[PDB]
Structure 1
Amino acid sequence: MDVFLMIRRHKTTIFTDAKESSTVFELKRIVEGILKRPPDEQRLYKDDQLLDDGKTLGECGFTSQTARPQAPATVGLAFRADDTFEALCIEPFSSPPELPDVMK
């Protein structure tokens, strides 16, 4: 049961598909190849809580319905550089203009 998700950190966003039977660690490995940082330096979060390596994606709550291709679920990322793991900071997307009047 493939789940579709967005992995975001700072101004970076990754769009990837994973199985519900896969784990945080397997997904941290996915981050490796793409972003060239080892799993030891990655913390992956659902909302504000760390996802423990070895918990299946469904367990983490990334249910098939919750993470859909049209509306992907966000898996947070923060990188551990040197002394401390960094605080989670996912920058927001641009704010849309005001709806034009004709549409209003």
Structure 2
Amino acid sequence: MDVFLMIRRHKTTIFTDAKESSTVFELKRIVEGILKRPPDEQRLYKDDQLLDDGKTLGECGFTSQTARPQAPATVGLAFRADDTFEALCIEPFSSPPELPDVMK
């Protein structure tokens, strides 16, 4: 089963899908192909939880019915700079303005 994801770091967001049976490490290889950074320089998160390489996305709670095409689940991403990893930082999207009068 396919799971649909946003992989997010700072002001970067990758839209992609993967198998429920695929691994965290396999997702890192996907990110590697796109952002040109190898798996050892990557940390993936579900919320604040650091994800183990060997686990499936399914085991880490990314399921076909929660990670939907029209409402993808978010995977956090952090890079190593030199020796150490930056903290997990995800820039929020912009805020919608107030509903015009005629939409209330």
TM-score (norm. length: structure 1): 0.99
Q: Deviations over 1:32-88 (max 9, x none)?
A: 000000000000000000010010010000011110000000000000110210100
Query: Sequence identity of aligned pairs in percent?
Result: 100
2-structure distance, mates of 1:24, 1:16: 14
Q: Deviations over 1:83-104 (max 9, x none)?
A: 2101000000000000011001
Instruction: Give the root-mean-square deviation of aligned CA atoms.
Output: 0.5
Aligned length: 104
In the TM superposition, structure 1's runs of 4+ consecutive aligned residues that sit over 4 Å from their partners are none
2-structure distance, mates of 1:81, 1:34: 18
1-structure distance, mates of 2:83, 2:20: 33
TM-score (norm. length: structure 2): 0.99
Q: Which runs of 5+ in 2 are unaligned?
A: none
Q: Which runs of 5+ in 1 are unaligned?
A: none
